Structures are given as structure tokens and as C-alpha cells.
């Protein structure tokens, strides 16, 4: 069968960051010529990606901030915004772009992956954002 | 069946950026010990990677760069045709930038390139690298 995956993004509706408020991600179709949903066995819920299939996933994200003091820190969260995932931090301290690392993680059916601001100084204008979820494996053996 | 993939980079030949000019990527063998091309069912054309098999791919890139500013995106087939989520930016020693990982449907022939979209000052690209790897066969019915 095919791996589970999803790509959910915002390229055309800026949003102000709010503490522990998931970023809006309304789009799933990044190809400008052949526009198709880049979703398979995940659900793009409007502000994140819900897992349908147990497995090991790669998760990561991007942001573009319209900077004018202004600072932000962001993480990925698991199910609720406070439940942040280690290795998923980004920070910002003209449009500037930030990208997270790639986190490998065991996820389960119903898990909801979101991008959340955890620290904000001044007003932070999110010009764009994108969340990447892709299955790398079935659940593996461990003790 | 193996996934399609390619890794094309420049580590040793700096280039001055210009608007909408794809960056040169002459190398495909990143391992310094066991130096082999990291290319399977893609083509490294000299300034990007061309897809040969339809599928969902992850695409991403890096740059090393030496008021001045530089903005870059990935483009699909033609330089102006930039891909959402693929921005990198440097606004002011060598500075490293990395894109996110974009998942996107690509068809045979699609050519992924790194392009500058905004430049102020002298932007010297000391190094660049483009990563393309197939996630899935097409997921349509």
C-alpha cells in the first residue's frame, strides 16, 4: 500500500501569532500547474494534520514572518498545544523564513500535529506556514 | 523497486546570485570516503534535478552565503514558477540557510531548481545543495 503523508500550508492568508494557538493551514495542493491534494491516509483539519495509521513519521515545518522589538519561538505539538515535541523548535529574533529540523516520531491513530507559538515578544505576523508529515515505517520492534 | 532520488550540490565553486538564475549544482557524490553518485531515476542537469518517474517527492535545499539581503525559492520547470513553502532568506562571515521539506506531486520531466527572487548587495553563494527523494508512487485512483 502507500505511505501515509500530508502537506498542509498557508501561502495566501497572513495571520498574527497567538500563544499556544495552532497556526491556520488551509491548503494541501502546492503544485501550481497540476493542483492535487498532497494527502494520503492523513487528515488536514484546518490547523494541523491528524494521523490515521500507526507508524514512524518524519514531521517538520516552515514559517515566513513579516518582521518590523519582535520575536517568536515555535514548536510542534502532539494533540494539545502545550504538549510540545522535542527537537521541533524554531525561533525568530522584510520577510524572513525559518525551517525546523526533521523529527522522527512514533505516532498513533487520532494524533493531531500542530504548529504552536510558545513565546512571543511584540506582534508576530505569520506571512506563510507549512507542515510536513510523512510515514517512514510501520511500527517497529522495541522494549 | 527502489525510490527515485537525487542529491546535487556545489561545495567548491562559489557563484554570485542573479535574479531568476538557477544555481549551479555540479556534484552528485557527497560521501568523502566512498564517493558514488547519489542519483537514482532522476537527472542532475547542472543547475537542478529533473524527475523521471511520477510520484510524491520531498524537495528541499541549503545554501551558504557570504544593507544586503537574499531571498531564494525552489522553482518548478521555469524559474519564476516558485513553489510555496520553499523560501530561504538572509538579511544583514558565511551564513547557512536551510529550506523546509516540501511534499509535492511531480511528473516525468519536472525540473526542480534553486532560484534567487530578491537580491540587495553582493550575494555570493559559497555552497548550495538540492535534495529530491520519492515518498510515494502516485496516490490517485
Amino acid at each position: 500500500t502507500l505511505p501515509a503523508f500530508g502537506f498542509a500550508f498557508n501561502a495566501s492568508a497572513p495571520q498574527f501569532a497567538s500563544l499556544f494557538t495552532p497556526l491556520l493551514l488551509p491548503s494541501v495542493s502546492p503544485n501550481p500547474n497540476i493542483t492535487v491534494p498532497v494527502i494520503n491516509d492523513t487528515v488536514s483539519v484546518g490547523d494541523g494534520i491528524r494521523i490515521l495509521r500507526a507508524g514512524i513519521y518524519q514531521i517538520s515545518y516552515t514559517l515566513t514572518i513579516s518582521l518590523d522589538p519582535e520575536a517568536g519561538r515555535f514548536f510542534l505539538s502532539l494533540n494539545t498545544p502545550a504538549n510540545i515535541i522535542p527537537g521541533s523548535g524554531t525561533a525568530v529574533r522584510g520577510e524572513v523564513d525559518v525551517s525546523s529540523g526533521v523529527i522522527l516520531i512514533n505516532l498513533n491513530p487520532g494524533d493531531l500535529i500542530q504548529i504552536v507559538p510558545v513565546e512571543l515578544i511584540g506582534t508576530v505576523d505569520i506571512r506563510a506556514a507549512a507542515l510536513t508529515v510523512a510515514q517512514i515505517s510501520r511500527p517497529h520492534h522495541h522494549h | 523497486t527502489l525510490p527515485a532520488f537525487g542529491f546535487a550540490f556545489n561545495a567548491s565553486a562559489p557563484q554570485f546570485a542573479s535574479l531568476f538564475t538557477p544555481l549551479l549544482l555540479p556534484s552528485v557524490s557527497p560521501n568523502p570516503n566512498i564517493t558514488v553518485p547519489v542519483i537514482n531515476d532522476t537527472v542532475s542537469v547542472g543547475d537542478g534535478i529533473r524527475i523521471l518517474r511520477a510520484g510524491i517527492y520531498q524537495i528541499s535545499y541549503t545554501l551558504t552565503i557570504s544593507p544586503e539581503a537574499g531571498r531564494f525559492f525552489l522553482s518548478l520547470n521555469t524559474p519564476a514558477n516558485i513553489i510555496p513553502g520553499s523560501g530561504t532568506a538572509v538579511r544583514s562571515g558565511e551564513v547557512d540557510v536551510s529550506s523546509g521539506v516540501i511534499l509535492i506531486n511531480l511528473n516525468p520531466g519536472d525540473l526542480i531548481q534553486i532560484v534567487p527572487v530578491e537580491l540587495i548587495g553582493t550575494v555570493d553563494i559559497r555552497a548550495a545543495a538540492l535534495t529530491v527523494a520519492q515518498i510515494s508512487r502516485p496516490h490517485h485512483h
Binding site: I34 | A54, N107, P108, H140
Partner: peptide
């Protein structure tokens, strides 16, 4: 030959 298209069907 397999290709994505505007006619491609999803769930």
C-alpha cells in the same frame, strides 16, 4: 506511462 493530471481522482 503514469502522470498526475487535472483528471486524477482522489478520495
Amino acid at each position: 506511462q503514469e502522470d498526475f493530471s487535472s483528471d486524477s481522482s482522489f478520495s
